[PDB]
Amino acid sequence: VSEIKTLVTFFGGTGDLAKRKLYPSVFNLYKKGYLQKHFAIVGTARQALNDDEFKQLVRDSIKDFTDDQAQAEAFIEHFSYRAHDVTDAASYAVLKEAIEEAADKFDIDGNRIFYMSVAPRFFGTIAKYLKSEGLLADTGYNRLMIEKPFGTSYDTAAELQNDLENAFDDNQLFRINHYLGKEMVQNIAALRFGNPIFDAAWNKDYIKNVQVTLSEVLGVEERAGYYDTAGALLDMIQNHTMQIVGWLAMEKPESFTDKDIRAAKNAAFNALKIYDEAEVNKYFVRAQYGAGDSADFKPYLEELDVPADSKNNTFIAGELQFDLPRWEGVPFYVRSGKRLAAKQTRVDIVFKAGTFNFGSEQEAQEAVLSIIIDPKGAIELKLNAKSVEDAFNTRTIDLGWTVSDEDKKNTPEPYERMIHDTMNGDGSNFADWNGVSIAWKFVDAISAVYTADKAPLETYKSGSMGPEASDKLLAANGDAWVFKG
Amino acid sequence: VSEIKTLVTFFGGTGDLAKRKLYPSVFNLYKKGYLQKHFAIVGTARQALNDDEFKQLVRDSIKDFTDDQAQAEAFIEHFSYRAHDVTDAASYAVLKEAIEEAADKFDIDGNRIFYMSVAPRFFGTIAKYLKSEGLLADTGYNRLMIEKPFGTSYDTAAELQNDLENAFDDNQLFRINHYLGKEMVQNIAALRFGNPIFDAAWNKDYIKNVQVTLSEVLGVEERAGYYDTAGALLDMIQNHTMQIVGWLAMEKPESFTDKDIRAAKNAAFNALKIYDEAEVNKYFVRAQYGAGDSADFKPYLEELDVPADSKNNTFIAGELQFDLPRWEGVPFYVRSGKRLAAKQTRVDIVFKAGTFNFGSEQEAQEAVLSIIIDPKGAIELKLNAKSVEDAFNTRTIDLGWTVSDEDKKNTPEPYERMIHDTMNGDGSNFADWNGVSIAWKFVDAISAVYTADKAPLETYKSGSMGPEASDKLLAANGDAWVFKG
Ligand SMILES: [Ca+2]
Numbered sequence: 001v002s003e004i005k006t007l008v009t010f011f012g013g014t015g016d017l018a019k020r021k022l023y024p025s026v027f028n029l030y031k032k033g034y035l036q037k038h039f040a041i042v043g044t045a046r047q048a049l050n051d052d053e054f055k056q057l058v059r060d061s062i063k064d065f066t067d068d069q070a071q072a073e074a075f076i077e078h079f080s081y082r083a084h085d086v087t088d089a090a091s092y093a094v095l096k097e098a099i100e101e102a103a104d105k106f107d108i109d110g111n112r113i114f115y116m117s118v119a120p121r122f123f124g125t126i127a128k129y130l131k132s133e134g135l136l137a138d139t140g141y142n143r144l145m146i147e148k149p150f151g152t153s154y155d156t157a158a159e160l161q162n163d164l165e166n167a168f169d170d171n172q173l174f175r176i177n178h179y180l181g182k183e184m185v186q187n188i189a190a191l192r193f194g195n196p197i198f199d200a201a202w203n204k205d206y207i208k209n210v211q212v213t214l215s216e217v218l219g220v221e222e223r224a225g226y227y228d229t230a231g232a233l234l235d236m237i238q239n240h241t242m243q244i245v246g247w248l249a250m251e252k253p254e255s256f257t258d259k260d261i262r263a264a265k266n267a268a269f270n271a272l273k274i275y276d277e278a279e280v281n282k283y284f285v286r287a288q289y290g291a292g293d294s295a296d297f298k299p300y301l302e303e304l305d306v307p308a309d310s311k312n313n314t315f316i317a318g319e320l321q322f323d324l325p326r327w328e329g330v331p332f333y334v335r336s337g338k339r340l341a342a343k344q345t346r347v348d349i350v351f352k353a354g355t356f357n358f359g360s361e362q363e364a365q366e367a368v369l370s371i372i373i374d375p376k377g378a379i380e381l382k383l384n385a386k387s388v389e390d391a392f393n394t395r396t397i398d399l400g401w402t403v404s405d406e407d408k409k410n411t412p413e414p415y416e417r418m419i420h421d422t423m424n425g426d427g428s429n430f431a432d433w434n435g436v437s438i439a440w441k442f443v444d445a446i447s448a449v450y451t452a453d454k455a456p457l458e459t460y461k462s463g464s465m466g467p468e469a470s471d472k473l474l475a476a477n478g479d480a481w482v483f484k485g
Numbered sequence: 486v487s488e489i490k491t492l493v494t495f496f497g498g499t500g501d502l503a504k505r506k507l508y509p510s511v512f513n514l515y516k517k518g519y520l521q522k523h524f525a526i527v528g529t530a531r532q533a534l535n536d537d538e539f540k541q542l543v544r545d546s547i548k549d550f551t552d553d554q555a556q557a558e559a560f561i562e563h564f565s566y567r568a569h570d571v572t573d574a575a576s577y578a579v580l581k582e583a584i585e586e587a588a589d590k591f592d593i594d595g596n597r598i599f600y601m602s603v604a605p606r607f608f609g610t611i612a613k614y615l616k617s618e619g620l621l622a623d624t625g626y627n628r629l630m631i632e633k634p635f636g637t638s639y640d641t642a643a644e645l646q647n648d649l650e651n652a653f654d655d656n657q658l659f660r661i662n663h664y665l666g667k668e669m670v671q672n673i674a675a676l677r678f679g680n681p682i683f684d685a686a687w688n689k690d691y692i693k694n695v696q697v698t699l700s701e702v703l704g705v706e707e708r709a710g711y712y713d714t715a716g717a718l719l720d721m722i723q724n725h726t727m728q729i730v731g732w733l734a735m736e737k738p739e740s741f742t743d744k745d746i747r748a749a750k751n752a753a754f755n756a757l758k759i760y761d762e763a764e765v766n767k768y769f770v771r772a773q774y775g776a777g778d779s780a781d782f783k784p785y786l787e788e789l790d791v792p793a794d795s796k797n798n799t800f801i802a803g804e805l806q807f808d809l810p811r812w813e814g815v816p817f818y819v820r821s822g823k824r825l826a827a828k829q830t831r832v833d834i835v836f837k838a839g840t841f842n843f844g845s846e847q848e849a850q851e852a853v854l855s856i857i858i859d860p861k862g863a864i865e866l867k868l869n870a871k872s873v874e875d876a877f878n879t880r881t882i883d884l885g886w887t888v889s890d891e892d893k894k895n896t897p898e899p900y901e902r903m904i905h906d907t908m909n910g911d912g913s914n915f916a917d918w919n920g921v922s923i924a925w926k927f928v929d930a931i932s933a934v935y936t937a938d939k940a941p942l943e944t945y946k947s948g949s950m951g952p953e954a955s956d957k958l959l960a961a962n963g964d965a966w967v968f969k970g
């Protein structure tokens with residue numbers, strides 16, 4: 001294939017994430033023939049290691065992904081290490097050499113990517129020094145991959161953005177987002193813009209309401225520590241839900257270039273309504289899971305590392321409003337939670353029921369277009385048809401499709417996609433500042449009410465699909481959740 | 486259920502069709518609880534028979550449809566016979582008595598249906614005498630069921646219509662049509678008008694071309710005699726194909742009453758273009774099957790009762806044009822033949838490919854909505870989506886649905902539906918004079934050229950889907966047959 005000439009530097013190269021997902025993902029790119037000769041991978045972290053040790057660690061990383069050990073070895077040849085502390089300005093000069101050495105060794109003309117697989121606290125610092133100690137390629141591109149999370153509020157995120165903008169331009173910042181880089185999520189645009197019947201129907205005239213669902217069966221388990229101060233709101237809503245919504249609510253772009261796609265999404269985000277106390281109580285529902293029908297389904301407050309006085313949300317459901325002509329009056333329902341009926345990630349576009357009366361006992365109903373993202377990719381379409389009865393009558397039928405085993409094999413894992421995207425400079429599947437900022441502004445307004453405790457905290461049974469209030473949220477507009485569990 | 490009070494008279498009651506399909510269909514209506522007490526069935530034909538003989542014949546008819554002999558017997562009690570010759574005006578007075586007797590015996594206030602399961606030659610006569618010898622109910626309704634065919638040309642059909650109109654009004658004439666009374670064909674309206682995304686897309690703006698296919702695997706077998714002078718053109722095209730097209734090309738009715746539905750269909754039929762010699766050669770293809778890859782797949786000319794000099798068509802494919810704003814420039818391709826790939830009856834609505842460019846190697850393609858009528862009812866929808874590849878690209882995926890075993894059981898057979906329709910007075914699933922006349926005018930113009938032999942007769946391999954010219958017919962508008970075999 002067309003070879004990719006790039007030099008990647010992994011800050012936090014000794015970390016679990018690197019050897020657990022990053023390195024294997026980069027290996028696949030080698031196997032697929034993308035990375036061939038003109039490329040290098042410079043690992044870095046505080047822990048001192050001689051090349052042999054690092055290369056072995058990499059060897060352990062790509063173990064289960066190896067078939068021909070010789071091919072793997074030829075790959076490992078492209079790795080190098082350098083002990084380094086991120087707070088030491090002078091210490092950076094060591095790294096500059098490592099990078100410029102590897103560059104020479106394989107004749108790589110710039111094209112540098114810096115993957116910060118380190119704690120949030122070091123993002124701004126590392127960025128600042130890459131610029132100061134002339135680590136940025138004087139030719140070719142320079143791109144930065146910011147691991148999650150990007151801020152914990154609007155202000156912290158704005159701060160982070162400021163620090164990064166002192167060394168990079170926004171179109172060079174590639175923020176990691178799991179669900180945005182998922183095969184099915186990218187289908188949305190194709191379904192919509194690729195089929196005129198849907199494209200022309202993507203608006204208020206045909207759509208009754210849109211639904212996004214991020215359901216998880218598991219509970220908090222051990223993530224209690226950080227989860228207790230983040231909850232579903234920041235963990236699932238602010239990032240995954242919000243960006244998926246972006247693909248759905250976007251206008252029709254002038255073309256499919258990441259630039260036009262982004263401008264299109266932003267048009268929507270800029271129209272999103274930010275709520276006040278009263279509105280958050282009306283359009284949103286915050287809940288925490290209680291006990292299930294068994295003992296092992298312990299209430300949230302009985303989970304390890306969870307404070308008894310906690311009023312943290314293990315579930316969030318709310319209505320989004322877009323002040324755009326296209327979505328005038330079209331509700332966007334979102335929900336994400338733990339200890340729910342089943343692991344499911346899906347989007348349900350509910351179309352308005354036709355007004356043509358057949359005189360049947362059962363008149364026309366609402367058609368539903370459904371995109372199943374997790375676990376198995378699927379696309380369903382509930383249509384109106386004639387029931388098999390003596391008298392003329394209508395009913396709904398489900399037209400369905402599922403990914404094949406072949407599609408299931410050739411599908412690239414998230415990290416490999418994101419990393420590969422960055423190498424090509426494809427920001428299409430990435431959140432930009434405008435989107436991230438709005439998402440934060442939006443969530444910030446909600447968090448305010450929750451921290452202040454000026455909103456009730458519902459409770460629900462472990463195994464259900466949430467609190468009753470969730471269903472009542474939609475019933476208020478005469479709607480209902482398509483996915484029932 | 487709401488009991489049906491009716492009195493049916495079967496002309497040609499001793500015929501194969503009556504005891505083979507008619508009577509069982511009427512039995513089912515009894516089993517389903519529609520016909521209960523106030524109903525009677527008067528059989529009639531030349532062959533003299535005493536009640537016992539007739540009732541036994543009926544008993545033999547509904548044999549394989551009986552479970553509880555006692556229930557069947559209670560039904561047979563409602564039958565009566567009367568020997569009769571249709572050309573004898575006086576002989577009709579005998580029948581008037583039989584009818585008025587049965588009416589009294591079960592207290593049936595009019596509501597008479599006269600099923601002419603006799604040769605075409607007797608249709609006008611029987612009709613004339615039903616009026617003359619006061620056989621028509623002085624109260625309640627009077628309906629007539631005309632078995633196939635309704636004329637063999639426009640003129641013969643107009644003649645028939647005239648004779649019948651001397652005794653009945655058009656809305657009382659229920660012409661039998663197999664494919665029109667098929668479960669799947671009735672779904673069309675539901676799919677279209679029940680789902681706004683399709684309703685609003687049912688026109689030139691979204692549709693590229695429409696395709697109707699009546700494929701049969703079998704050859705002529707023994708039907709050679711009458712088939713040689715009828716061919717596919719009159720056998721499948723003029724009646725089945727033409728009326729199905731009607732459901733597809735109709736405008737949007739003011740309501741779903743048979744009246745409005747009919748006016749809607751007529752608006753289309755009145756816009757259909759009738760061809761001349763040149764046009765028939767351009768927009769239509771006439772063919773006859775040759776040999777297959779085996780001996781038992783004998784050429785049409787080697788079939789029993791087929792004249793060696795025959796230039797009869799065992800296959801017909803053509804383009805229909807509707808001079809209506811809604812179908813301006815939208816081709817309607819129709820095809821029907823014998824010795825083709827497989828038994829199939831389907832409708833393919835091909836939508837225009839979107840013009841939104843993704844920059845992918847494979848840009849958007851044409852979406853296809855498919856309604857499978859025979860054998861197993863199914864509905865498929867080929868949509869545009871994203872292919873599972875590293876680079877962004879589009880592909881087509883098939884969303885599908887199939888009738889369930891339950892839907893397959895509860896589905897009423899054609900004759901039972903038609904007969905039951907007539908009892909309720911539901912002309913929705915019936916062709917009217919305007920439709921029949923236009924279909925005939927349309928086919929007549931074609932037959933003219935064929936009889937005159939001013940059009941070529943193509944040949945094709947038994948087992949294929951027709952002659953090459955068929956594919957070339959569509960290629961000319963940049964189209965292709967969806968069903969490939
Ligand atoms: Ca509301």
Ligand SMILES: [Ca+2]
Binds near residue numbers: 961962
């Ligand atoms: Ca043409």
